[model samples]
Target: GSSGSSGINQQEDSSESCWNCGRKASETCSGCNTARYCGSFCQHKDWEKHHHICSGPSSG
Candidate 1:
């Protein structure tokens, strides 16, 4: 990955804008493969909400 503003811009920062409570994500969660989020609570929430969606694709 590039190491500049361009790199940051290329990211799908949607998770940075939490899909859960719509709060801005402060840091990225490393639980799921490609998924990212603000904090642990939000990450846990995402897992509870969309774990099934990620489980299959991430496994293979």
Candidate 2:
């Protein structure tokens, strides 16, 4: 099988980004750990849309 010879300037683990602006953000939701945000306010702005899908993380 092929190995780590794919690209030269690859990024870190898909580079988690903010769900709001679609840009790189460090903040992430504790609920599902999927909803990322740049700021707390950004989270609120998109909360309305994310609330329904905000299923807390659980076991498999």
Worst 10 residues of 1 by lDDT: 6-15
Model 1's number of clashes is 0
Alpha-carbon local distance difference test for all models: 0.58, 0.75
The lDDT of model 1 is: 0.58
Clashing pairs in 2: none
lDDT of 2 by residue, 1-60 (tens): 867866578566776789889878778876777899997788767776787787644422
Score every model by TM-score: 0.44, 0.59
Poorly placed runs, candidate 1 (over 4 Å): 1-15, 29-33, 56-60
- lDDT, candidate 1, 1-60, per-residue tens: 666555344555443565555667664445455555667677777776667656523443
**Model 2, poorest ten-residue lDDT window?**
51-60
Off by over 4 Å in 2: 1-13, 56-60
